[PDB]
Amino acid sequence: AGILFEDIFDVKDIDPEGKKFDRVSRLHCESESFKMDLILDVNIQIYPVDLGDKFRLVIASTLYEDGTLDDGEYNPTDDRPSRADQFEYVMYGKVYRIEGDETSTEAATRLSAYVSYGGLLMRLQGDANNLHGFEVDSRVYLLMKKLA
Amino acid sequence: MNAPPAFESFLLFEGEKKITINKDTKVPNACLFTINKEDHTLGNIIKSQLLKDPQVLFAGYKVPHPLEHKIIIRVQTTPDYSPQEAFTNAITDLISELSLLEERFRVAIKDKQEG
Amino acid sequence: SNRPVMGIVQDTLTAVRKFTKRDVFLERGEVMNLLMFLSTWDGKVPQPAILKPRPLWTGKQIFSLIIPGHINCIRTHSTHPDDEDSGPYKHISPGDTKVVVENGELIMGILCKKSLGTSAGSLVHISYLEMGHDITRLFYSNIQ
Amino acid sequence: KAFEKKFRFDYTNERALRRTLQEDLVKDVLSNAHIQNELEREFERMREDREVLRVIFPTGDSKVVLPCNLLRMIWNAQKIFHINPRLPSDLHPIKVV
């Protein structure tokens, strides 16, 4: 598998502070049946998004549908493995911080994983039980698909 | 006083070779072509034609100094295909396109005048 | 004054900010060219950030290839407000300030005079102190 | 109070110990007494250094110029050795001292 996370989100805001960038907007999504807030920057020129949209988000450690990793080297002439091409929007990043709700003695109950997709950041808060697949410095894919 | 003559930008002198082929040892199936007395007029066409090929993984060109006339082209291709074959096919396809374009322009002139 | 005496001067410096904005997405051919001008390049084209519906790289994704070795640094852009560091979004930075370089990769932030300039602790100063003159020379040339 | 809390190394609570240090090390820390004496002597030395610093630098200026960048060296070590900060470590504080 290699699918670290999978959920359906709804868009609540596009730019609460304002339009900071011409071609990039920051979605403020909330989950469904998981109660996990999301803050994602999406290229809107290539992949337009507006309010109220529902998309299915998948965060996977590999794209190859069998388990093997990719080594991070770009190669377009490798259609043989039949990668996960059922999604519309795909990004590739590196998780750089896992904040938590720890203390001196008690362990954490809520985490917050940050991933940087070459500039376009993402924060994914929620419960600490379904967020266990994330380790810092690990390459991560993001896959989106709008539900009609 | 130190002005180079104008013809030095397109005339090969005694000893200079037009094109020299060197391999790239960093990555497999990579090759560098050095062309003397050329510029963007050829570099750009060859690069843009190499990029059309689906078996070419890298294709670029650069002019190392504007005061020295020399073109360097780097192409890396998928295995079971060589960059020399990619280069030769690119040049052949460019020639075919230009010949077809000239034929059609000549017929268009003929249609435009006295027609 | 134990600072770097030379840094990027005003034209690569007026353009590295625009390069390192978030919006800069680079096509395949543009990436080919820019890598053709890199002297310290391994030979492997990195995976694009945006992979569908069209492969797009990013300016930070190529300045990461420019930055040498494994350099760790944290600077701050010249238009960074006085509330981001205090309130929420400390590590999310809506305006793309708070430059962060981890393992020689530009994770976030916009590069300006306060990162590539001739001030103490800048990115070039860290590159010198960590790698040496022979690598800082290539750093300068490749950036330009 | 902040100085003591930040630099004391409480070895009594033992829940912070189980959370931060490994299991084979927490038993050693809670059993030995020479380790505890060394750990208290370290804080004594730090307090004396604090008083010396306050004499040298009145008006409370922390900024100083020194040859080795310890924090950046620590960051480099963390990234080089792939240290995971969410797990207990195998570093003995006596080995540190």
| B93: CATH | 3.30.1360.10
* C-alpha–C-alpha distance, residues A85 and A94, integer Å: 21
* C-alpha–C-alpha distance, residues A84 and C20, integer Å: 30
Q: Burial code of D33-62, b = ≥16 C-beta within 10 A, e = fewer? A: eebbeebeebeeeeeeeeeeeeeeeeeeee
Note whether residue C2 is domain-resident.
Answer: no
**Token pair belonging to A136:** 């810092």
**Token pair belonging to B107:** 């017929």
H/E segment holding residue C115? helix C113-116
* C-alpha–C-alpha distance, residues D79 and D77, integer Å: 5
Q: Report whether D11 contacts D36 (CB < 8 A).
A: yes
Nearest CB among D69, D72, D79 relative to C103 is that of D79
* Residue A145 distance to chain D (closest CA, Å): 33
Work out whether the CA dihedral B24, B25, B26, B28 comes out positive or negative: positive
Amino acid letter at B64?
Answer: P
Interface mutation target, options A95, A110, A111, A136, chain D, most CBs of D under 10 Å: A136
Sequence-separated (6 or more) residues with CB below 8 Å from residue A24: A41, A42, A43, A44, A120, C22, C23
State how far Cα C30 lies from the chain centre: 18
Sequence-separated (6 or more) residues with CB below 8 Å from residue A62: A2, A68, A69, A70, A141
Domain count, chain A: 1
Q: Report whether A92 contacts C49 (CB < 8 A).
A: yes
User: What string of DSSP letters covers D11-43?
Assistant: -SS-HHHHHHB-HHHHHHHHH-SHHHHHHHHHH
What residues make up the domain containing C64?
11-144
Note whether residue C73 is domain-resident.
Answer: yes
C13-20 vs C59-66: helix crossing angle, rounded to 10: 130
CATH number at residue C91: 1.10.274.100
* Residue D76 distance to chain C (closest CA, Å): 7
Note whether residue C25 is domain-resident.
Answer: yes
Q: How are strands ordered across the β-sheet holding C105-108?
A: C73-74, C100-102, C105-108
Task: Note which residues in 17-46 of chain D have CB less than 8 A from chain A.
Answer: 19
Experimental method: cryo-EM
| Cα-based distances in Å from C69 to A94, B56, C35, C41, C101 | 18, 29, 17, 12, 11
Block residue for tokens 């290699």: A2
Q: H helices then E strands: how many in chain B?
A: 2, 4
* C-alpha–C-alpha distance, residues C136 and B56, integer Å: 33
Q: Burial code of B97-108, b = ≥16 C-beta within 10 A, e = fewer? A: eeeeeeeeeeee
> Going by beta carbons, is chain B in contact with chain D, meaning 3 or more pairs sit under 8 Å apart?
no
What residues make up the domain containing B86?
1-115
Domain count, chain C: 1
What residues make up the domain containing A127?
5-148
Domain count, chain B: 1
DSSP state of B68: B
Amino acid letter at C123?
Answer: L
* C-alpha–C-alpha distance, residues B96 and B110, integer Å: 21
Task: Note which residues in 118-137 of chain A have CB less than 8 A from chain D.
Answer: 135-137
